[PDB]
Ligand binder design. Structure first.
Ligand SMILES: *[P@@](=O)(CC[C@H](N)C(=O)O)O[C@H](CC)C(=O)NCC(=O)O
Ligand SMILES: [Ca+2]
Lengths: 190, 349
């Protein structure tokens, strides 16, 4: 999965998240087309109560069915401030897309972080099942001590996500940030 | 500040790949609008970011015009018409992750080409051939493999790409994944791109590309047929949205769960003085972790393709429902997931 964001000179905005599901999908090219084929069917619930590759579970609503669209977590997101497009964001991460984008919003609104600060700040994640507070490197050991004392089951795991974000200032000036977690990416403008 | 945003006065593109970002910036400089550039970036990533940029997958687009009109494009894959409820169970009734992840049965009918053309035709200003041309050139003439692509080919590509002759012919070289500094030319993809540019999206869903997908499936026990490809459609849908401290948040509706649960969690958090706790505080992380639990619990029960099941999106994004969740959160005691079930939505319908 990969997310990108666009804002043009007129103030139009687009946020796109799209995907083969896993990296390279099935790895199967379709014939002589050169096109790799998705493995999106794993986003259905294969059997009620059994997790998929991201640990997500389902039942009847997300069961496999003909012509059905499997449930996604992708969340291209736009936040509006004072009536105007203000933050354009999104991210890969399967189940963690929801919490990564959430943290971008909270970081921007509640903590007043600029779009690069919001992007480079560390991330945490809890998805009900499995029952664990997933964290990235970068949280204080003092803070992690308090969470475990509260009963959180802290689990240090791989870096989460790749936000690619644009914030629109009041004068219409643009501010952008690519994720440190992804190399060879770029935010650029003119 | 320790961290500084990139700054621009006119237009801006942010993407996972430097080449695709520059493609989008160039389209803006040539006079394309944000939708034009977004479609050009999506086609360029289908060449330079084969990990995830794609023609053979799907996704979602959120568009907000300068005039405030906000809309969502659903170009999520559709399961084949021959897909069945238990198609991924083994003979014992247990899900087989190999069937849903690495076999030809793993694929849904791709929607990316349909979604980009729906957006381009209605909200763009350039012809498809013009926004596909940068990708076409990258496929035909090649580009240098960078660290990101080399690393992904070695780590993730090694598990699947060399197991299919046509994939191995493109992404492997001298028995190894393409290395950093090698040149990746994709002549077949260039032909596919050239045909889409000339004949439009029906090349993918009804033309030579569709035949190539259908034969690949028919030869290897897959299910996508030409009827599937001819019946696919992208769908414009109303965004899911909420209000958080006077900011409005727009995101994807079902068949995505994202918008619902982002709005639901924000609704829960709105009951707490998050600013006062501050980033990286145990209190803020406690409250967010607890709120997230209830949403993912709801996700497992209520979310699916809205054309097949009624999603109670009003109740899930209802602030009184969120308030009933916030009152359960103990800032000093986490509640085990074993004690969390999907919420009772009836009083909020
Ligand atoms: P995407 O985020 C999978 C998206 C789901 N299919 C969906 O539609 O919800 O996959 C990437 C690549 C495997 C990922 O999971 N992680 C990269 C990251 O950003 O952490
Ligand atoms: Ca980066």
């Amino acid at each position: 999965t990969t997310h990108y964001s666009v804002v043009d000179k007129d103030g139009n905005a687009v946020a796109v998240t799209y995907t083969l599901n896993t990296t390279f999908g099935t790895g199967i090219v379709a014939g002589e087309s050169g096109i790799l084929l998705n493995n999106q069917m794993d986003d259905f619930s294969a059997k009620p109560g059994v997790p998929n590759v991201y640990g997500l579970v389902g039942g009847d609503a997300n069961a496999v069915g003909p012509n059905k669209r499997p449930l996604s977590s992708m969340s291209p997101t736009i936040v509006v401030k004072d009536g105007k497009t203000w933050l354009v964001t999104g991210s890969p991460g399967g189940s963690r897309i929801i919490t990564t984008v959430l943290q971008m919003v909270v970081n921007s609104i509640d903590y007043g972080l600029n779009v690069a600060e919001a992007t480079n700040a560390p991330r945490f994640h809890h998805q009900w099942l499995p029952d664990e507070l997933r964290v990235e490197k970068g949280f204080s050991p003092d803070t992690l001590k308090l969470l475990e004392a509260k009963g959180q089951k802290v689990a240090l795991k791989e870096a989460m996500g790749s936000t690619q974000s644009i914030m629109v200032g009041p004068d219409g000036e643009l501010y952008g940030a690519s994720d440190p977690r992804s190399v060879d990416d770029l935010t650029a403008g003119y | 500040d320790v961290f500084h945003p990139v700054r621009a006065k006119q237009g801006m593109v942010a993407s996972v790949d430097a080449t695709a970002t520059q493609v989008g910036v160039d389209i803006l400089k040539e006079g394309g609008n944000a939708v034009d550039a977004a479609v050009a970036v999506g086609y360029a990533l289908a060449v330079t970011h084969p990990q995830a940029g794609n023609l053979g997958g799907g996704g979602f687009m959120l568009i907000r015009s300068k005039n405030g009109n906000t809309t969502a494009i659903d170009f999520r894959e559709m399961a084949p018409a021959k897909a069945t409820r238990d198609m991924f169970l083994d003979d014992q009734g247990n899900p087989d992750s190999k069937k849903s992840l690495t076999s030809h049965l793993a694929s849904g009918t791709p929607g990316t080409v349909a979604g980009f053309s729906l957006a381009l035709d209605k909200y763009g200003t350039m012809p498809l051939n013009k926004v596909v041309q940068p990708a076409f050139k990258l496929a035909r003439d090649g580009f240098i493999v960078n660290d990101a692509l080399a690393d992904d080919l070695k780590t993730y590509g090694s598990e699947v790409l060399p197991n299919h002759e046509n994939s191995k012919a493109i992404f492997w070289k001298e028995g190894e994944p393409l290395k950093k500094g090698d040149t990746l030319v994709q002549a077949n993809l260039a032909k596919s791109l050239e045909m889409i540019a000339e004949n439009g999206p029906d090349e993918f869903y009804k033309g030579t590309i569709a035949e190539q997908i259908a034969q690949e499936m028919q030869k290897n026990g897959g299910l996508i047929t030409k009827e599937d490809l001819a019946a696919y459609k992208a769908v414009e849908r109303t965004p899911i949205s909420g209000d958080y401290r006077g900011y409005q948040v727009y995101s994807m509706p079902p068949p995505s769960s994202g918008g619902i649960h982002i709005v639901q969690i924000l609704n829960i958090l709105e009951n707490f003085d998050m600013k006062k706790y501050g980033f990286g505080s145990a209190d803020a992380m406690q409250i967010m972790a607890e709120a997230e639990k209830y949403a993912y619990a709801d996700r497992s029960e209520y979310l699916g393709d809205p054309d097949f099941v009624k999603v109670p999106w009003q109740a899930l994004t209802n602030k009184a429902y969120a308030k009933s969740i916030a009152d359960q959160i103990d800032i000093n005691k986490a509640k085990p997931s074993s004690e969390i079930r999907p919420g009772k939505l009836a009083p909020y319908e």
